[PDB]
Amino acid sequence: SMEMQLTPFLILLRKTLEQLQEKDTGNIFSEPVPLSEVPDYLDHIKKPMDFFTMKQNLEAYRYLNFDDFEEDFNLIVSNCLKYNAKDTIFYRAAVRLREQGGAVLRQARRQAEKM
Numbered sequence: 001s002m003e004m005q006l007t008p009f010l011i012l013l014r015k016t017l018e019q020l021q022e023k024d025t026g027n028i029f030s031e032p033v034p035l036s037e038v039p040d041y042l043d044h045i046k047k048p049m050d051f052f053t054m055k056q057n058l059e060a061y062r063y064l065n066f067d068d069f070e071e072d073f074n075l076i077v078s079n080c081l082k083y084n085a086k087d088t089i090f091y092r093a094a095v096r097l098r099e100q101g102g103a104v105l106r107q108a109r110r111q112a113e114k115m
């Protein structure tokens with residue numbers, strides 16, 4: 001809205017990002033998928049995403065509404081479901097992050113709406 005302030009919103013996004021990273025207990029989404037180990041990754045995945053990149057986007061003022069932030073989170077999840085077979089831990093880790101992280105995201109968006 002007209003009066004919504006930037007700094008409390010960024011503080012909220014930082015806290016939310018930390019809470020989401022806590023759900024990724026193996027830290028498999030902490031840094032970009034290592035393209036040197038996965039040379040076919042970009043054949044399947046058009047926009048890689050990870051929590052370090054999200055932190056850099058946050059601090060570069062690229063996230064100005066909650067959708068901007070949640071869309072990149074959803075890329076982390078959807079890219080991982082798309083690339084990895086269902087019988088892998090990586091696939092299940094994306095399911096777990098979607099489920100547990102969705103709860104973090106709903107409460108955070110509610111706080112943003114009060115701003």
Ligand SMILES: Oc1cccc2ncccc12
Pocket residue numbers: 028029033034038080083084090
């Ligand atoms: O190394 C990784 C971490 C998280 C997700 C991945 N998805 C495909 C290939 C490698 C991955």
